[PDB]
Design a protein around this ligand. Structure first.
Ligand code: CL
Ligand code: CL
Ligand code: CL
Ligand code: NA
Length: 194
């Protein structure tokens, strides 16, 4: 058996040599299930297009912008106020400490019973500042592929559960294609999502 820190060293190294990731994404926010497709451009950019409605979620690793085309405008908040950013892997690696959620063994996604997933708990290093998310539990399938990210707001409010399926790496995302930061016309909001 290897330690959680060694397991995550291996995850970290895997994701430093990937250009991009596409996935089917389900996530829970404000009591609603949102479903769509994630395009993540490493290290720190993403866009989510939703299947059933016209909203678009965009992040540059510092701000999370939601486009609401039925209203003709967008709203942005800090993605993780208190973080220095740099993308998921750098944040987890530098601002959180890691442990196995239950054990070093392969477990079910939801319980400690036998299954196919490694589950890591990431706990905020408060000497790096408090943040709006104090902890994450991330479940990894056996090729270091992320299956689920659960984010626990520091407020103690409802957790945010992100399910990733049909993960595909290096699909080809052009750099000019997308603008990931909030546009000039965007409306800053304190925290409308967590
Ligand atoms: Cl609900
Ligand atoms: Cl925190
Ligand atoms: Cl603009
Ligand atoms: Na859509």
């Amino acid at each position: 058996q290897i330690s959680a820190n060694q397991y995550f060293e291996g995850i970290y190294a895997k994701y430093q040599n990937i250009e991009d990731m596409q996935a089917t994404i389900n996530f829970t926010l404000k009591g609603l299930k949102q479903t769509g497709v994630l395009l993540y451009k490493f290290p720190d950019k993403f866009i989510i297009n939703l299947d059933s409605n016209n909203q678009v979620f965009v992040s540059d690793g510092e701000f999370l912008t939601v486009y609401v085309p039925s209203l003709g405008t967008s709203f942005n908040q800090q993605l993780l106020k208190g973080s220095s950013g740099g993308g998921l892997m750098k944040v987890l690696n530098s601002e959180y400490s890691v442990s196995y959620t239950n054990s070093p063994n392969l477990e079910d996604l939801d319980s400690s019973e036998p299954g196919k997933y490694i589950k890591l708990t990431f706990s905020r290093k408060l000497y790096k500042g408090a943040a709006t998310i104090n902890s994450f539990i991330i479940a990894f399938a056996p090729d270091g592929i992320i299956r689920r990210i659960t984010a626990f707001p520091t407020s103690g409010g409802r957790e945010i559960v992100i399910d990733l399926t049909a993960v595909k790496f290096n699909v080809g995302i052009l750099d000019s294609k997308f603008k990931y930061d909030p546009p000039k016309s965007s409306n800053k909001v304190d925290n409308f999502l967590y």
